[PDB]
Design a protein around this ligand. Structure first.
Ligand SMILES: CO[C@H]1C[C@@H]2CC[C@@H](C)[C@@](O)(O2)C(=O)C(=O)N2CCCC[C@H]2C(=O)O[C@H]([C@H](C)C[C@@H]2CC[C@@H](O)[C@H](OC)C2)CC(=O)[C@H](C)/C=C(\C)[C@@H](O)[C@@H](OC)C(=O)[C@H](C)C[C@H](C)/C=C/C=C/C=C/1C
Lengths: 75, 396
């Protein structure tokens, strides 16, 4: 397990449109389940992440991802 | 999102046959129908449907449609028993019908009649058959080994299944991949590769070229591939898949189906077109003239088409086969099975060792949401809404 990203480092929140497939399957099904203000561990399987390709140079193939997500605001 | 209805159908499906049905609808009703074939419509329809703008009607495999249901309208049918009961089951999600089934698209064994007058009825024949054909200067059998859709029919032949079905439900916890039947199936496929009867690297593209060229005696494919064998001036026929250990090869079968978008206001107009124009011996024929659908859900025209050994063979492979479940966890099945097979062929893992992995990988939830801090519990994100989050991401 190694850290590949953090918004809290950059100190700018991250905004995505739900259902537009801007993000991985695990984030669309996953954050849709969070209430506003909730913080949760998203344990995403490779199927719902980058699967057998992975993300070139950053995430290997068949990599299960863990995300610490806090849903701050809806817009 | 207009007063006329727009239809989306794949480029291999013969949209011009469908167009002539739409033009007949126009002569009778006045409504203009335009049929499109977008490059990646399967992935595109969900992105646009979430905005509330997409086509009125979409034609795909029933399997993708299960995900659309978790963005698609219930159809109301009453005296629509013109279609087979098993085709209706394909388009049913939580006891609700999602679409109108059209075609049964089962894999078959296709074979060059000039290279092989009588195809082998068993898998065990093919090694011996390949030596006889290899001496002549050609192969026995080439098909996609990369995608598990094509390898599975052999694997599940002596037992073994994606997800066990009991009490009218699928059990996402009970996977049938690390059982004996699966292992026997897979090990025979690996052995064919180990004995240079098939090559791990061969894919759909590679296999298609060889059979159309006439370098290979037999391929494995659906009726989507028929128009290209037709053009290639190769005397071919379609038969039952060879049995493994006396059991038939059981391919997963996709049904071409017609769903309606919830954001289509033309639902009443769309329903009439499907019920009373498309699902008609003449309607379906107009399509089949352009590109064959194989076996069709309508009994009327299926009783006609099954006079052709191809369409009769397609239905046979569909009966001995099982219909493809539309439940979400099938994503994680196909992923688990594709990696297991590819690595068995690679010799990375043993067969017993890859299927062990597959049994775990198939049953794993796509995403698990465990709470760290609780939320308000009322407000949930809705499709077309921007989510503002902080996140930390790391590998597990
Ligand atoms: C600097 O940091 C990068 C993101 C990094 C890349 C590497 C990964 C380890 C990671 O560190 O994010 C990461 O932690 C991760 O895995 N993420 C980010 C958080 C959401 C979940 C996941 C992800 O889906 O990233 C995404 C993943 C990597 C790729 C996508 C996966 C889903 C798939 O459907 C997409 O199809 C294309 C591709 C990247 C994103 O979240 C960004 C926002 C989205 C895209 C780039 C595409 O949707 C793009 O397609 C044209 C768009 O439509 C966007 C809106 C257009 C605008 C101008 C682009 C904004 C780009 C922002 C880029 C950012 C902040």
């Amino acid at each position: 397990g190694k850290k590949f990203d953090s918004s809290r480092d950059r100190n700018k929140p991250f905004k995505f449109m739900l259902g537009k497939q801007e993000v991985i399957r695990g984030w669309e099904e996953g954050v849709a389940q969070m209430s506003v203000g909730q913080r949760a561990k998203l344990t995403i399987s490779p199927d719902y992440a980058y699967g057998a390709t992975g993300h070139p140079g950053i995430i290997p193939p068949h990599a299960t991802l863990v995300f610490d997500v806090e849903l701050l605001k809806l817009e | 999102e207009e007063g006329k209805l727009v239809i989306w159908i794949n480029g291999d499906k013969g949209y011009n046959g469908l167009a002539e049905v739409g033009k007949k609808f126009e002569k009778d009703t006045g409504i203009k129908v335009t049929v499109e074939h977008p490059d990646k419509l399967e992935e595109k329809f969900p992105q646009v449907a979430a905005t509330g703008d997409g086509p009125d009607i979409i034609f795909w495999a029933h399997d993708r449609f299960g995900g659309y249901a978790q963005a698609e309208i219930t159809p109301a049918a009453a005296f629509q028993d013109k279609l087979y009961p098993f085709t209706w089951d394909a388009v049913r999600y939580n006891g609700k019908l999602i679409a109108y089934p059209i075609a049964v698209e089962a894999l078959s064994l296709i074979y060059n009649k000039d290279l092989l007058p009588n195809p082998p009825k068993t898998w065990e024949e093919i090694p011996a058959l390949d030596k006889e054909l290899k001496a002549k200067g050609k192969s026995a059998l080439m098909f996609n080994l990369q995608e598990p859709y094509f390898t599975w029919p052999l694997i599940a032949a002596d037992g073994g299944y994606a997800f066990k079905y009991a009490a009218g439900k699928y059990d996402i916890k009970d996977v049938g991949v690390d059982n004996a039947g699966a292992k026997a199936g897979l090990t025979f496929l690996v052995d064919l590769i180990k004995n240079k009867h098939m090559n791990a690297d061969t894919d759909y593209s590679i296999a298609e070229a060889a059979f159309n060229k006439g370098e290979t005696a037999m391929t494995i494919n659906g009726p989507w591939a028929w128009s290209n064998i037709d053009t290639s001036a190769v005397n071919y026929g379609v038969t039952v898949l060879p049995t493994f250990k006396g059991q038939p090869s059981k391919p997963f079968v996709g049904v071409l189906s017609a769903g309606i978008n919830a954001a289509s206001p033309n639902k009443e107009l769309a329903k009439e077109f499907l019920e009373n124009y498309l699902l008609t011996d003449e309607g379906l024929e107009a399509v089949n003239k352009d590109k064959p659908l194989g076996a069709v859900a309508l009994k009327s025209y299926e009783e006609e088409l099954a006079k052709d050994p191809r369409i009769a063979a397609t239905m046979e492979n569909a009966q001995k086969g099982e219909i493809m479940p539309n439940i979400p966890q099938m994503s994680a099945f196909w992923y688990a099975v594709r990696t297991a097979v590819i690595n068995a062929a690679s010799g990375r893992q043993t067969v017993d060792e890859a299927l062990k992995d597959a049994q775990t990988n198939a049953a794993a939830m796509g995403v698990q949401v465990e709470t760290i801090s609780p939320g308000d519990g009322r407000t949930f994100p809705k499709r077309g809404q921007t989510c503002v989050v902080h996140y930390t991401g790391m590998l597990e």
